[PDB]
């Protein structure tokens, strides 16, 4: 029985004027435009770094594969197993404050 809170609750009917201050200032808009462009450039840098990480340690696993082909094939098989005892993974997110 799939029922979710994607629906909007009935309690929002007629009082949205806690912020009738939709008027905005020109200096604010200029700051937001320049600053969203800075955010775009920053996320470009972060994505470039994470792609470098992906490519690097995929290259590491590849070089592992050809060295293992150089050495031994049963070694190759037992390092390409599907190890169905470690898939049920769980990890706590990085906390704000330590215990």
């Amino acid at each position: 029985i799939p029922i979710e809170d994607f629906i909007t609750p009935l309690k929002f009917l007629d009082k949205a004027r806690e912020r009738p201050q939709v008027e905005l200032t020109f200096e604010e808009t200029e700051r937001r435009a320049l600053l969203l462009k800075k955010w775009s450039l920053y996320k470009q840098q972060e994505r470039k770094m994470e792609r470098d990480t992906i490519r690097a340690m995929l290259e590491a696993q590849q070089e592992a594969l050809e060295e293992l082909q150089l050495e031994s094939p049963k070694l190759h098989a037992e390092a390409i197993k599907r190890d169905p005892n470690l898939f049920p993974f769980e990890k706590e997110g990085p906390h704000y404050t330590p215990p």
């Binding site: 309690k11 929002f12 009082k15 949205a16 806690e18 912020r19 201050q21 939709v22 937001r32 600053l35 800075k38 955010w39 920053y42 770094m49 994470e50 990480t53 690097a56 340690m57 290259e59 590491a60 696993q61 070089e63 592992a64 594969l65 060295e67 293992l68 050495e71 070694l75 037992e78 390092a79 390409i80 197993k81 599907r82 190890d83 470690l86 993974f89 990890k91 990085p94 906390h95 704000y96 404050t97 330590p98 215990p99």
Partner: protein
């Protein structure tokens, strides 16, 4: 074969403390706060405060901030767990209570004819087990510690050799779940290290090219 099948591991303590934000990121947390305040609707606390203000105005012509104050004072009496682990541990690089915003990896001092230096924990492959078996037996043969820790998968992670008939190193990756190291004053120096200090502890091709697969992000 003129080679030695030697495995190694990469036991990593994950970051516990969330990484502090850059100036751009804290500015944009503030902006996201501003715009969600602007584009929300229907705060029940604000309803209660405004309605109580209006009825108080009616009574004065003819509440919520006390609750605000009391949660503020209980916030100000409650202390946070201090995150300044640099001050909490001086420079004790062997302790697990070091930098919690970053990711850590184990390293052991060892002596060898080639290099009497810091290495990742080693074993020589017995012909009747998986190199995952060599990984868990290194975890068993480390010095008086219970790491309840998880292996990321039966797949190699790093491959570095030197010739001395050739010692091949079969670097892994493991993940410390919640274990710790008994006998903290160990005779064998166990350092917990990042990449920036892996620069200090690991010099060249056999041990410093591990920057290919150590993950700092």
């Amino acid at each position: 074969s003129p080679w030695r099948l030697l495995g190694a591991l990469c036991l990593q303590r994950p970051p516990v403390v969330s990484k502090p934000l850059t100036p751009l990121q804290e500015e944009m947390a503030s902006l996201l706060q501003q715009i969600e305040i602007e584009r929300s609707l229907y705060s029940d606390h604000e309803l209660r405060a405004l309605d109580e203000n209006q009825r108080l105005a009616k009574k004065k012509a003819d509440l919520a901030q006390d609750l605000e104050d009391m949660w503020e004072q209980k916030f100000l009496q409650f202390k946070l767990g201090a995150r300044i682990t640099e001050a909490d541990e001086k420079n004790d690089r062997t302790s697990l209570n070091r930098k919690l915003d970053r990711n850590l990896v184990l390293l052991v001092r060892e002596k060898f004819g080639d290099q009497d230096v810091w290495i990742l924990p080693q074993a020589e492959w017995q012909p009747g087990e998986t190199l995952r078996g060599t990984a868990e037996r290194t975890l068993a043969t480390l010095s008086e510690n219970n790491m309840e820790a998880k292996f990321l998968g039966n797949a190699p992670c790093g491959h570095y050799t030197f010739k001395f008939l050739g010692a091949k190193v079969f670097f892994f990756k493991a993940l410390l779940l919640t274990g710790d190291f008994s006998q903290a004053g160990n005779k064998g120096h166990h350092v917990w290290v990042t990449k920036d200090e892996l620069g200090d502890y690991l010099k060249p091709k056999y041990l410093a090219q591990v920057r290919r697969f150590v993950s700092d992000l």
